[model samples]
Target: GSQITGTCPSGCSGDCYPECPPGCCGQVNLN
Candidate 1:
């Protein structure tokens, strides 16, 4: 499963932008 920690400047689409800082983007956790 996956989750969004905070608001993504470029929007959370399973990936983060190059300009986006760490933690600011979405995250994925596989159990």
Candidate 2:
């Protein structure tokens, strides 16, 4: 799992975008 520790750009000025899980995939034939 990943974490977002209040990291944002200055142009947004403290405003931050909601963090979301990126697209993921798994082996269909794996245990």
Candidate 3:
């Protein structure tokens, strides 16, 4: 699965903050 690095919003779970999981792509800042 592909993962990205960025800031995550509140109430975010599963590999949040730096690297987010699959469906959590939209939850990242994408910088």
Candidate 4:
């Protein structure tokens, strides 16, 4: 039972479209 969603445009150094854990609800991409 977890809340893992889609890609997030967070801070990046050498990686583009870094993937991070979902927030309260989750990413809209998965919707």
Among the numbered candidates, top lDDT falls to 3
**CA deviation > 4 Å runs, candidate 3:** 1-7, 20-31
TM-score, per-candidate, Cα-based: 0.17, 0.16, 0.22, 0.16
Candidate 1 vs 2: which has more lDDT: 1
Clashes of each: 0, 0, 0, 0
Encode model 2's per-residue lDDT on 1-31: one tens digit a residue: 8965663343332233333222212112223
lDDT of 3: 0.53
lDDT of each: 0.48, 0.32, 0.53, 0.38
Tens digit of lDDT per residue, candidate 1, span 1-31?
8864544465543344443555745553322
Candidates by lDDT, descending order? 3, 1, 4, 2
Model 3, range 1-31, lDDT digits (tens) per residue? 8867654455454356565444575454425
What's the lDDT for residue 18 in model 2?
Answer: 38
8 in model 2: Cα distance from truth in Å? Answer: 1.0
Candidate 4's residue-wise lDDT over 1-31, tens digit each? 8765444444322222344434522433423
Q: Model 4, stretches more than 4 Å misplaced? A: 1-4, 10-31
Clashing pairs in 2: none
Candidate 1, superposed: residue stretches over 4 Å from native: 1-19, 27-31
